[PDB]
Amino acid sequence: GMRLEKDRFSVNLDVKHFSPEELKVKVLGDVIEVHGKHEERQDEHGFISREFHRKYRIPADVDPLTITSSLSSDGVLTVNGPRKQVS
């Protein structure tokens, strides 16, 4: 899920049933959305679909342009961004 920490915002989600092309991480203003949709036409007789949609608020001290995302081999999606810190 979402974890706000002293020096970063991060979201970690299980997305093992989705290929990278089936995932979308949208950052617009101070909102992050994560979406996934996976469909299988198993056969002549039908299909299965699964999907998810999540939305989170980015704290004001995270520049949304600094948000990035990566996907691990075991299917965990991480979205993260640094918070402004003292120099």
């Binding site: 990278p20 979308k24 991480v25 617009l28 990035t68």
Partner: peptide
């Protein structure tokens, strides 16, 4: 060993 997931910003 992570794959970068591009951010959609529109």
């Amino acid at each position: 060993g992570e794959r970068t997931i591009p951010i959609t910003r529109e």
